[PDB]
Design a protein around this nucleic acid. Sequence first.
DNA 1: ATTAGTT
DNA 2: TAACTAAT
DNA 3: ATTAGTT
DNA 4: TAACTAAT
Lengths: 252, 252
Amino acid sequence: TWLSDFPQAWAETGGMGLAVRQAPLIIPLKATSTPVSIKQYPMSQEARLGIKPHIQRLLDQGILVPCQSPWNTPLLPVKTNDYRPVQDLREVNKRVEDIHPTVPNPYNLLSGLPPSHQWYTVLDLKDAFFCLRLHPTSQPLFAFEWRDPEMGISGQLTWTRLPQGFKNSPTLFDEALHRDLADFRIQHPDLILLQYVDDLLLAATSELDCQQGTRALLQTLGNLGYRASAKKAQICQKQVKYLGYLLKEGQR
Amino acid sequence: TWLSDFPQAWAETGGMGLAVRQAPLIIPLKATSTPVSIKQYPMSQEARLGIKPHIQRLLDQGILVPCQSPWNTPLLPVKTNDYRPVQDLREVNKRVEDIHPTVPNPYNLLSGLPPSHQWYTVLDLKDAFFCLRLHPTSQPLFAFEWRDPEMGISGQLTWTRLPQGFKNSPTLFDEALHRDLADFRIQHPDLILLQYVDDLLLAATSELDCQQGTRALLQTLGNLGYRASAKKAQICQKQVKYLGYLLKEGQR
DNA sequence: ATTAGTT
DNA sequence: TAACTAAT
DNA sequence: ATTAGTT
DNA sequence: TAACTAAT
């Protein structure tokens, strides 16, 4: 299937992602900004156990690393009864320099969809932000304290990739992905590609230009280091669900 | 003094007032209006005793009279620990046809005060509304229930003069007083007269044109049936207190 | 005694 | 979304 | 655990 | 002038 011909393009078969052509991002602070260090809130054993596995996997993939930073924000337990780690980065958001909100809202994104393109492929990239590297100078910004009493493990960890919870993560990825798919857009003039952060839509007039496009797009995302979710892929269809909207023939 | 030469013009010496040249007023209702009859609220003996004297005086002067009406509004006790009668006429106000608010606000009234008139006389009429008669067809509107258990006196009373609490009483009096002092305004072109309901101000350039005006005005108010309060009169002065404002030379 | 109107 | 101030 | 924001 | 809902 589509899964056999493109092993590299799917998170199921391709491994962890990594945008190899994108330089590590530098995060500029405001002109008056100084490091803020919030002490970790005491966490229950239940949450600490629920979260510990996610931390260890991240350390193993190298997405998380030991560090020592004058910045520190609190880790939160958030529950379905599974505990995800959720860094509260608002005090870091407050101190980072604003960037233009270049990402269009869904509505406007769809307006630029001609009606002659009724064959749809919808992909969503898996763990998009973690594919973008973080420059070592900007990594200390996102440090949190990891403290596993029942193991003697206390110390700070921070991120090597674009983190969850950072106000600029969605815009910076959308821009990064636009850079990487600019050449694809030029090699396929008759195709339409909509990008909403980690949510893509390819549109053609024939189910064949679509097949030939989805192949090309999957080929390209895999070679650039991105991974689509095959579980949610909607390939060469006449109606698809994109950004809440259901697109059938042209309606909506 | 001014009190000896004008006995008729002062409430102190002139008796109860009565605008003899003004026909009894008819009060038109709205087009959809029907009589409303609110039952008297049970009143304590303390209030009933505090209010009883005021009622009896009013019956004696003929300002209050027995009647039988499909209209009825509640009497209230209001306290200084003296109990005044206060008819709640809002449900009657709601059903009476609106009239233009021709009375100007103090501020605008004063704007038309030239600076060459720095000699002031300020009068305020006593019980102004009660000087205006009420047409017998409009009297039932303002009926209240008077019930003195410890005397066997129960039954309805209503007003023969413009009542307190009626939304149109101030405008209708101001208009009535303007009609009555129109000729005075013509016989004294060099005088300035401001009227705010029951609050008058005469203004001249000399303390003599003022004396000769105050005499003429007192003469006129007395013959028309109005009564000024001598206790509060401010006669031929260079500074006076009118409608909150203090008028001295021309300032304010 | 009711009620229009207000952070 | 909690009670007053004034008004008649 | 905090907090921005809401009749 | 009384507590929430979601957000990180």
